[PDB]
Every structure is written in C-alpha cells, then in structure tokens.
C-alpha cells in the first residue's frame, strides 16, 4: 500500500536519526510493532501525524503510544462490564454530561489558568462488545496538565455519583472500578492504533467545552461538526502543541527482540503440560 | 394571495365568535389591522398560527400583537441607538453570552422550579440600522413568568455591566438605557408581525440552555440547528403551551389603511410650519 509505503520511508531514512534507547526519558512515541522508541521534535511529530492519519483513512495497521511524561493532555481509559454484547447507545446527553463532570474535577483542581479557553473532549468507542467487555477512551488533548493533577482528576472521577449513574443507565455492572486508575502513566494510543490483538477504537463525538474564569457558572458543551475536516491522529495527540481545532491550554504545574522470526518456539513453549517436573525440568 | 384569503375566511367565519370588547381582560390576541380583539382557546390559537406561519413564509402583511397578560413568557425589546447606518454583527458568541447573563436574573428571582429543564432563546433582529436606530427583541416563550417577576428581571438586566460591554463592542452608544422596562407589561408583535409603518423582525440565531439544580454551575446553551422545522410563529409565541420545540417550564406565581397612498399625504403635510394656523386654519 502507498501510504504504508511513504510511512516506511519517513520512519526508516528520516527519522531514525530520533531513535532512542529503552527507557529513555526524552522517549515521546512508540512503535510496538517495530519496537522502536524515537523523541521527536514538533515538526518531525506533525509529518509522523499526516502518515498516520492518511494510513488511518485507509484501515492500514499501526500500533503507535504516545508518551504521558509529566505535562501533556489528559486522557481517561474506561474498560466496562455490560449487562449484554449490545454495544451501549453512548448519545450526546450522556457523553456531554460526562464532560460536564471530568470538567468539575478539572476545575476543582484549581489548576486552570484565568481567562476564557476552549477545551475539546473526544471520546473513541472500542468497535464491538466481546463477551460484555467493552472500552471508551476520553481524550482531553489540549488541557495541558501535570501527570500529579491527573492522577488527582482520576481518583476524584472514579468517586464520582453522577457519572457511575450515567454508567448505570448504559448498561455498566463496574461503575466504580472501570475507569484505569493508571489513565495519567500509561502510554496513549494514537488514534487510529491498538495492541495487536484489538481493533482501534473510532471517534463517535467531539465536544467543545468554553469556561470562562469571570463567569464560572456559564460551561457551554457543544458537539464538534467538522471533526473529517481535521487531522484527527494530531488533533487527538496529548503531547502536540501545534494542532489547528486543539489550541493548548497551560494549566499549573522485554529484551528477547524475535523480529518475528524466533518467536514461533513461543507459540509451542505454552502448552507443554509441564508443570510438574521431577526429572523433566 | 391564497393563505392570506385562507387567514380571511378562518378570522371571520370562524374565529369571530371569540371576538373580545375593548379593555377585556380575556384578550390573548389582537389584530392591529382589523383592530379587532379575540380570547382564543389553546385549539383556535393553533389554528390561527398555523395561518399567521403560511402568511409569513410569503411575507405577508400582518400586524397581529399578543397580551402577555399576568403569567407567560418573557420578553426582552432592546431599541439601540449604534455608532453607524451598519448592522451590528451580533454572531453566536455575543448573543451566547447575552442569554447566560438573561439566565443569571431570573435564576436569582428564585421562581425556577427543581429539577432538569430547557429554555429556548430567540433573538429576532430589526432587518435594516435607520438614522442609527437598531433594534431586537430576546424571546423566552417557553419560561411562564409572573408579570411582577418580569419586571424585577428587566430591572436588574438594565443594570448588568456585562450586558452593557457586550452591546458597546457592538456599536451601541444606549447601553444603559436601551431596554424598555415595559417590556413585561406590553403586547408583544407575534413572529412575522410589525407596526404598520415598519418591517418585521426577523429570527437570526435561536438558543438551547439546560438547567439543573442538582448541578448548578453546568449551563450548557446549545444553538438550535433545524429552526425551520418548526412553525415559528408558535414556537415563539410567549402565550402558547402547545409548541413542538417549545415545551413550557412553569415558574412559581387608530386605523389608517393607508394603501400606499395617504402616506405620500403625510410626507408632504408635516414639512409646513403651520402647525398652529391663525389665519389659515
């Protein structure tokens, strides 16, 4: 595929010049399946984003994480139990109200700079129930928040009534233990990825949220309409500062290596029925 | 016209038995043309807007005002006096934030009922500036106010010093004078409907707020897309209780017919100095 191709030809003569070791801080985006870790600098970032999003239009295959680190946009990972293998209607209501409550805890926070700002909430939808698991992601890309005041956020959103009746309503039998405390360290799939066994998630909604510190009760929560118009691999990225729809927001602050080769052993090392081992060990 | 005669035939076959006298309390609509006064029940105001509505999407003449009477819907009359001959932009953000402030009155008149509910704001605007005269009307038809608590809101929105920038960076030289403190106690011109020597306001932008008591500081004011959808001169309608969009929230408790020719008489009868006349009276 072309698109795959020219992705093959940045990665490989352009940017491994920003190829990182394991484990290195300044490390930003992962690709599991190459296994490569690179620190990208904004311009090289945005060119990564156009193949991904014109890989993305295509369905083409990718498994790209961005790193958290200790500043960047906020992301909430929701792994629901459902009452069925019916796919919740997950409607605008309930989405918007969703927003409304991260919100309160944003603000709560006492982080947000003064001032009128717009923030934008997307919400990407696991395409199918699997045996009653089903998943949402929550990105908040733009509100640029230290990694401690996001592990607050969660802790206070994991608590928080209203949204465990919203999750009720929709068919959730984990209310209170679906949202990943661990949302604030993990590394983030960029949109249009997924672990190797999964599907990637879709945008189903985009939110635009306006707060205004001289008029604290006014918290006006709009749908998105041009979300296509964008590049939304770079419009949902925590870590870009260089998007058009999503402006930021400063708030206060394995070693093995197969290569698909050797692993096919792996495949047959599992089931020997070799737990016990008096002389077999 | 067709819908004009149909308006003809409803009015005088059928609607005449609701004629009301001068002065009459039960009055809900007058005819300012035909200078008649009717009391229609819920039924026959339908039937009558379902009228007024074809009439108006082929501009007809009407002159059809409504009494606000002790309890109904509110409305806003703001006559502005502008720096220029130019139609003011007001776009989205400023009406926007015009409806918040509205908002912020009559929830400190403390009358909103507990509980989760829509509002409806239409701006319908003056089509042309005249020797810098300017003018809208706010309609919240839906909000069933008390006349004495109309008038405390109407009041206290005179006085609103944000209210009063947002109409300055529009190019209004009256902020603190433009809204006519009778606003509560006039009839109101139904949609499509002006005084005789003007043309009648037309719907620009139309507003959605939710309020719940339970959360407070969460206002969102959803614009309303499919406007056409809708008869408008129902919707609007600060009297009716019976709209699709519009669903009431309750709050606690001379003739002329110039024709186009006796207009030219009196554009060459005031110029004279002879308003008094001793020897040529």
Redesign the interface.
């Known amino acids: 595929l072309a698109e795959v191709q020219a992705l093959e030809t940045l990665l490989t003569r352009e940017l491994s010049v920003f190829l990182t070791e394991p484990g290195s801080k300044k490390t930003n985006i992962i690709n599991r399946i190459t296994g490569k870790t690179y620190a990208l600098p904004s311009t090289e970032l945005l060119r990564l984003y156009e193949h991904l999003e014109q890989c993305r239009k295509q369905g083409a295959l990718m498994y790209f994480l961005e790193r958290q680190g200790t500043y960047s946009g906020l992301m909430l990972d929701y792994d629901l139990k459902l009452n069925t293998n019916a796919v919740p209607p997950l409607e605008p209501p309930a989405l918007?109200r969703l927003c409304?409550r991260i919100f309160?805890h944003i603000k709560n926070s006492s982080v947000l700079p003064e001032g009128s700002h717009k923030i934008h909430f997307f919400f990407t939808l696991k395409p199918e129930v699997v045996q009653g698991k089903y998943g949402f992601h929550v990105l908040i890309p733009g509100l640029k928040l230290a990694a401690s005041t996001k592990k607050s956020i969660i802790g206070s959103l994991q608590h928080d009534a209203?949204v465990q009746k919203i999750l009720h309503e929709q068919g959730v039998t984990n209310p209170e233990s679906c949202l990943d405390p661990h949302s604030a360290s993990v590394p983030s799939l960029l949109y249009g990825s997924s672990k190797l066994n999964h599907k990637p998630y879709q945008l189903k909604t985009g939110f635009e949220l306006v707060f205004d510190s001289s008029?604290?009760?006014?918290?006006?929560?709009?749908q998105i309409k041009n979300l296509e118009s964008y590049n939304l691999v770079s419009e949902l990225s925590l870590t870009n500062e260089q998007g058009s729809l999503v402006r930021p927001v400063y708030c206060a602050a394995m070693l093995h290596d197969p290569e698909a080769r050797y692993l096919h052993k792996i495949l047959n090392l599992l089931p020997p029925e070799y737990y016990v081992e008096y002389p077999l060990w």
Chains 1, 2 share one sequence.
């Open positions: 918007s409304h309160v209203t008029d604290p009760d006014y918290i006006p929560i709009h």
